[PDB]
Symmetry: none
Subunit: 247 residues, 6 copies
């Protein structure tokens, strides 16, 4: 069975995610479920799409990426299942949540989830995430052919992007464990930096500047980022996922 | 072959404790699968955990042990109980009623008190029976230890009381991720005149953004919500009538 | 076959990062079991993580890799160390002392520095060695890569210092039970020897919480054997406003 | 000379209690006229009494004391307040907001707390301040005791909150005419047929529609109301107070 | 000032009757208002007419009888004011409510109430009872000449009667405090009675028969009545007003 | 000059009868003030009315006539009695004991039987002596007719019996409060059968819906629920047993 990677905005504070996992193990006995996160802010599709970008790279090809942020649950908004160029399967509401992950790994095939046999038979309109997305992810992980899921659709719904302009960018995400600030400006779109978020030393890593000192760097994904060594730059500057311009 | 262990407690995820319980389980039952239901039950809150455990029997396989401990009585006269339900799933929890709703949903086919040291973690620490009795017994059962080896038959596990609806009810739980409000009134008991006009909806998106709505939640109980908003935040509303 | 990987970090659960580490581990070691110890270690806090890792060797099987990273030194001269203990468990962590208490509890039978690129994630990102060195090495070891292939022998992993308790008994609040508000000290209960006169009042010495009235104060030996103070069904930290490293005196 | 005393409470008419209050008043103020407004306020229901007291200032002379007590706080820290309004009428009630609507209609020219024992019934029984403070003070004021002798100035009497109507028009059934079954809302009529949730013909009076027929109108106070001609709309629709949307 | 005797179907459960009394005291300071009753069943003109029959006899000549049961309020149905042979004044809607009272005391003069000066200047169509009937009763009690009220009308509107026939009649009213049954058959139209409502002992008063025993008598008004001694005959027999009664 | 007439009966307010009595009184005594005590006494219930009349003498002026009639004996050998008490108030009622508690509280200074037709309503209807004897006599006395003109001296008005407490009288029907015949001075918490009852100054010293024990306005031990009906909760009716442990 495929490994199921699991993301949602439902949380860990009660039984709901656990019930989804139990349903998956019911459908696919012996399945491995790795949580990516369930702390996506409520209704926040863009945040989840950002969190899912690298998931295809760092998971095996024998994977189902199960993700649901679904304020459209129980409406005309269907669930989409996708095979990418890596050969991984992806299941999510067709509201664009898979946008960045699909840009990174490609769309080799995409169908709408309409076959009741891959659903949890009484799909509750308020919890399609469990009864359609999770159940379909488990059925696919068990080896159900993607073609059985429903009709081909040309392209999954896609989120829009306001890229950086040559430089002017934006704070895309904040490292909430540490206070580090990430931008959408790729570092290759270039030692010190004059930037508005002041002179920022360009560093390999955090510890090349004194403790509490400011620093600029390329994060794990390759995008320009700002930080304080052993400190929270967000806390100091009060910045929220804002501006950014490299002079 | 080993059962899947479903794991609930009020101990948390902020340090090693739950991880140590899981390591102990894997020591007792190598190759065991442990699915967390949640460990964010508010401290000492048995009723909250019982509410969270109600649907767990339905949505887990029959080859399951439900390991749950909310145990302010740990290291006292209050024993640990192990149960086989009508689905054939095993359940392990302190005999303080925490299994009440789960047992109402799935039945009591057999129940024994956990007294045999061979299913315990030999130096059971009085302050952490949850690990040394409940978790160790759940792992031994998952490994295939017969329930009869666990200790003496007891007629009924201790049960929590309920104040049902009369329509008058209470807010049973709040969806803490979203702010949705759940009641104990079954929907089987269009608009609603209610004290907490609410449009009766299939789902959240049948009303404008920030709009109020009434519906039947996943479990079938009347619930109130704001579309893409927190009704709890708006109304400041658990334990807090539908006019006909 | 594969070892169980026990996983600790200060990176969190609020986004994809820990999940990406787990996916990398499953890529390196298919069919691996990953048990989270915790990922809520306060940022940069090596001492807190070392305290959290002390009992991990005892309560995990011998066929285990303990993968832990709290790494404000990531991408610097500070290497990653891999250790075999007397229980035969493997441990992988930055060589900044994070493994100190775990190693005191289970011993150092062998320790090497992680320098071989074949056990790393080939483009190791300097800001995330925790993923690209620590996690990848933990997965390769769990898959059965010999520890000797990891790099050069080093005599002793870097060790954290300790300020133990003294007899006048004066120690400190080591940790606080953040779920419950219970207060833990570094004073072993066996140093004591029913009620306690202590500065943190008279504290009844109890087997467990429920031997005192609800909201009542109590003293006891916690799961690890160290003197602890609590309120029955209450938060002693909340009542007394105590935070970790605060002084504690046991009057004799 | 003496003021007319208008008398409201939730104590009832089924036994001697209201009569004993009236006797006490006549003891304090011989020759006083006591007109009952009502004593059938539902028990502990301050909001209902405040609604019932709104028009009382308009339809009584200026030489009046409005004596009202709904007092689940009797014998506690909750004092009794005495008020002079812009009409020059006096008002006596527990300072729990019961005078809210009456005061909004007639104004607060002066307000003091009743603390002087000389205007009280000397052994004030904690369970019946309504008699021993409110009624006795109303009688002493009706006899001509200066309001300033009653106790200390207080800036504003305690006031009940209101959830008014909103233009989307959504309001509530404020009161029901319990003699007839007519339904009153908080929507002023100043805010022909009506599309409403509770088609309603808009009428001058009840008899412009067939017997048992539905009708919408502006009641005596000017607020939108619904009724059945020679019938109980409450009985037909099962509507209770605090339950109205007017579609425009 | 005249004594005002006050009857309506509005009730005592809220402020309405009290507001009418306050209006009367505004118009006529120092006026005495005696309630006859305000528990007339809603819209029930016949019941009120029955209740008003003896009112002229048992009140002084210096009286205004103010009565309103007014489902026709705010319509073409005016208010009538009457002087009877006793010299008492009467004010009521011209829908027949004064029928029995007028049969007992006579019509010496009757006018329609049309002069705005005896009305409450903004007469609310839904509450003429207050703004016309009560205000006119108060103005008359203050000494306003009846001729100022409006135009002479020959006869007030009168209710019809289905009298008893030689003997057969009906249950006219039930004593709702006690369960006693009253008929329209005068006792002088007749020791024991064979009657359908059984042999009924003919008694001076209730206590001439055993407790719970049946009895026949002439009530205070002189009409044949049936009762149970210390019991409710209505409760036993389930009889409601208008039900036939036959004396054999 | 005329006395205030305080008026109690079991006849009711649902029709004209009480109003006709008041009109008769105003005919006899012009300018008289009539204060209703109550007319909702349960039918034929003399004991209930006697309980309701106990405090009436205290809280009314001395220049008063207390007119009360609960009269299932109307038009029989049972006469009407008129009384002057030690406060100097006059009282008129059927001589069936209805004045018992009021007289115990205020005393009997003089008592006569009402037999003089000049203080009656000349055609006294046997079924309504309450109007034609009791009310008319109350009005004539209020007008200043000497009590001695009313009829013959009688030594003691008929008196109701009492079963006192030994070492539930009424229920507050507006609120559900329970009153006993045990004086509070025959005594912080109470062990009682009607549970531990907190002894309170007033209702609001206990949580909403909470039980409480106290001394009512008259000084007798009483039980209540704060903002609730204790009668409704416990289904207790008057005369039911109570014991203080
Ligand atoms: N009040 C709400 C409004 C809109 N969506 C909600 C609400 N509550 C829960 N949800 C959504 O329901 C989904 C369940 O499939 C979750 O992904 C969540 O985003
Ligand atoms: N201060 C405390 C008082 C009562 N129970 C506690 C306390 N701290 C931890 N516990 C309980 O100990 C249990 C360990 O088995 C936990 O389930 C938890 O509820
Ligand atoms: N701003 C920062 C300063 C120092 N260390 C950081 C910072 N942000 C993340 N880290 C560290 O990077 C490590 C990644 O291997 C994490 O363990 C974390 O402690
Ligand atoms: N059981 C009760 C609880 C609270 N208030 C009460 C209770 N019984 C009577 N009262 C109040 O006492 C007041 C007497 O001043 C009345 O207005 C009434 O509202
Ligand atoms: N719904 C109604 C229909 C007809 N008459 C009414 C209605 N409500 C009140 N009234 C009448 O209005 C009169 C007010 O003058 C009252 O006498 C009463 O009978
Ligand atoms: N059916 C009845 C039996 C006995 N007494 C009655 C009955 N009906 C009325 N009465 C009494 O007649 C009295 C009139 O004086 C009232 O006080 C009342 O108690």
């Amino acid at each position: 069975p495929r490994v199921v990677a699991f993301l949602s905005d439902v949380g860990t504070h009660d039984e709901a995610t656990g019930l989804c996992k139990g349903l998956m193990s019911r459908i696919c006995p012996g399945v491995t479920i790795i949580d990516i996160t369930h702390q996506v802010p409520a209704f926040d599709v863009v945040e989840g799409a950002l969190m899912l970008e690298d998931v295809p790279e760092f998971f095996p090809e024998h994977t189902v990426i199960c993700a649901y942020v679904y304020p459209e649950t129980g409406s005309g908004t269907p669930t989409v299942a996708v095979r990418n160029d890596k050969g991984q399967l992806l299941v999510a509401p067709d509201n664009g949540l898979l946008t960045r992950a699909l840009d990174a790994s490609g769309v080799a095939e995409a169908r709408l989830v309409t076959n009741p046999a891959v659903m949890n038979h009484p799909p509750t309109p308020t919890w399609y995430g469990r009864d359609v997305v999770a159940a379909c992810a488990a059925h696919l992980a068990a080896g159900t052919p993607l073609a059985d899921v429903g009709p081909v659709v040309d392209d999954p719904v896609r989120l829009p992007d306001v890229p950086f302009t040559r430089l002017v960018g934006r704070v895309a995400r904040i490292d909430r464990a540490f206070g580090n600030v990430w931008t959408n400006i790729p570092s290759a779109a270039l030692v010190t930096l004059d930037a508005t978020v002041a002179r920022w030393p360009w560093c390999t890593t955090f510890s090349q500047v004194a403790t509490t000192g400011r620093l600029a760097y390329a994060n794990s994904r390759g995008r320009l980022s700002f930080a304080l060594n052993r400190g929270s730059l967000v806390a100091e500057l009060g910045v929220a996922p804002a501006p950014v311009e490299v002079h």
